[PDB]
Amino acid sequence: DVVGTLSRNGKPVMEVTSSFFYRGNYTDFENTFQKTVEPVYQMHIKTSKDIAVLRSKEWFQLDDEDFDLLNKTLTFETETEVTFKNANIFSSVKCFGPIKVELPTKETVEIGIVDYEAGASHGNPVVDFLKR
């Protein structure tokens, strides 16, 4: 699956997404990879256990560690690069991107980073977090 980005006067106009398939047997997991740009997710911090949850999350690094998250909407412009070992085992997962906050002006500013890196992963913890 290949992403064709077409642009006019420098600005992108349309995206052309095509999924192609080679029939047969491909055990080519060395050069097999997955480079998806994970969708952004908003997280509303109302309760005191929610900030406890995100601070319990290792991958949540902040620019200022003392930054209050109470009554804030945090967005994750996160993208994941996975190298494969098997059809399901991921030989290494690198899920990273800037964590921003919706300001009172509703402008977005980078206040933290997701810098998740792991070896023989069967999936992403961040994605499991997100579906619950």
Binding site: K49, A118, S121, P125, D128
Partner: protein, 237 residues
């Protein structure tokens, strides 16, 4: 009475009130009537009434506040009634005893208050049956505060509530984080990670023995019987 507020006071409450106040009065009443009927005068009965420091403080314990309050009248009514000769009153303001509130008990002890185990408070009461206190109680009604300085705490309810909230929320948070790190660990390392860490348990089967007598080594058994017994008895008899 647990979780009965001022609008919930009903049949159960009224019965409780009748156990803890009214029939107690009827008991003293009847003891007076039996003593008086045999002319007992040098032998009054020392009643140790269990008073409480909490008087509609904690709330939602129906008519347990008014039951333990109203027995204070006995201190005055020792003088204005004629039964003073047969009965003596030892109201015991009963402190915090342990063994629902046991979890926070350590928490209140940080506030320089003492909570008693059942055996400590029992020993304390038995204090009030010592000859000296009896003789004391035969002169005048005695109040004995075994509260352990708890009364000093200003508006105790919210302080017990705050302790409950901090222990319960610490419990909950740790439970949530312990589940919601293990789940993501299981996703990351698959089920095969903690499949080999899941161990087999060997449940017992019943093995009904015929419990034959155990036969000690000949060395041991020879030291039970004396020396001459060997070859002495006819084994046929």
């Amino acid at each position: 009475e647990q979780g009965i507020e001022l609008e919930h006071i009903d049949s159960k409450s009224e019965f409780a009130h009748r156990i803890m106040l009214t029939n107690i009065l009827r008991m003293m009443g009847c003891v007076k009537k039996q003593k008086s009927a045999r002319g007992i005068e040098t032998r009054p009965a020392q009643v140790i009434l269990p008073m409480s420091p909490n008087h509609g403080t904690f709330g939602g314990d129906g008519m347990y506040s008014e039951s333990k309050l109203s027995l204070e009248t006995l201190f005055n009514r020792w003088h204005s009634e004629s039964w003073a000769n047969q009965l003596t009153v030892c109201g015991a303001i009963i402190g915090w005893t342990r063994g629902a509130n046991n979890i926070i008990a350590e928490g209140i002890e940080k506030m320089g208050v003492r909570t008693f185990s059942q055996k400590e408070m029992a020993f304390n009461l038995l204090g009030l049956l010592t000859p000296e206190v009896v003789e004391l109680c035969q002169k005048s009604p005695v109040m004995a505060d075994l509260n352990g300085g708890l009364q000093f705490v200003p508006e105790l309810k919210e302080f017990t509530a705050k302790l409950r909230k901090e222990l319960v929320e610490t419990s909950e948070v740790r439970k949530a984080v312990s589940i919601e790190t293990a789940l993501e660990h299981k996703v990351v390392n698959g089920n095969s990670a903690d499949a080999a860490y899941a161990q087999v348990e060997i449940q017992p089967r019943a093995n009904i023995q015929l419990d034959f007598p155990e036969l000690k080594p000949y060395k041991q058994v020879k030291q039970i019987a004396p020396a001459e017994l060997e070859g002495l008895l006819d084994l046929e008899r």
